[PDB]
Amino acid sequence: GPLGSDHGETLCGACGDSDGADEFWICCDLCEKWFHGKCVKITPARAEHIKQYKCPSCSN
């Protein structure tokens, strides 16, 4: 695993990792955090039916 980071990185609001290759991401329209689709359990197909995504934290 690489040491250090990319200063121009986006971190998943759930797992806290960087973006990798061929990953599906989704953004909360309220807090504007990004999430691995795998981490919030949303597929591209499902996300197609989502008008405005609201993350678990904002949904409380």
Binding site: G20, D22, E23, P44, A47
Partner: peptide
């Protein structure tokens, strides 16, 4: 929703 798919290697 605001989504994105990253590229391959």
């Amino acid at each position: 929703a605001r989504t994105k798919q990253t590229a391959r290697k």
